[PDB]
Amino acid sequence: GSRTSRITALYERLSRDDDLTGESNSITNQKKYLEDYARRNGFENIRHFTDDGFSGVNFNRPGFQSLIKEVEAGNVETLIVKDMSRLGRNYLQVGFYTEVLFPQKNVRFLAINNSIDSNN
Numbered sequence: 001g002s003r004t005s006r007i008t009a010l011y012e013r014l015s016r017d018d019d020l021t022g023e024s025n026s027i028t029n030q031k032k033y034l035e036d037y038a039r040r041n042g043f044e045n046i047r048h049f050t051d052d053g054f055s056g057v058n059f060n061r062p063g064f065q066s067l068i069k070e071v072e073a074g075n076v077e078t079l080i081v082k083d084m085s086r087l088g089r090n091y092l093q094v095g096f097y098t099e100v101l102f103p104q105k106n107v108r109f110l111a112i113n114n115s116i117d118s119n120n
Contacts, residue, residue: 006105007045009076010034011067013054013086027051034080037112043078058088059097071097074104083113 012030023029031048038046047070049063059068070076079102081087087094098109098117109116 005045006075006077007047007070008038008043009049009067009070009079010038010046011049011051011064011079011081011086013051013082030082034082034112037110038078038080041080041110043080045075046080047076058090058093071102071105071107076102077105077107079107079109081109081111084111084116085114 010031012027012034014024014027014030016025018024023033027050031050035046035048047067049067051061051063054061054064067076067079079098084091084094087097095117098107102109
């Protein structure tokens with residue numbers, strides 16, 4: 001109608017070619033990671049956008065499409081990611097998402113393994 005409960009976006013991606021071997025060598029593991037964050041941070045409706053055989057061009061993915069689907073509908077009030085590498089190092093397009101795209105719902109993007117948009 002007018003006012004309702006939107007959501008939080010938790011999008012993750014694990015790679016089988018990494019030399020990690022331990023936690024991130026599956027799927028639900030890194031998922032739970034972001035979870036530990038969103039909870040330690042205080043985010044609601046933490047939606048988990050799973051990864052499986054993701055391309056290496058930029059955006060537009062299965063689980064990602066769900067993530068973006070929430071963004072377009074104006075639900076994803078926050079974005080929790082292991083790092084900006086998921087969406088790409090191309091801060092031009094990635095930024096567009098967080099600066100012009102996400103504004104619809106007032107987003108707080110998080111990149112654990114890289115400075116999302118801070119200073120220090």
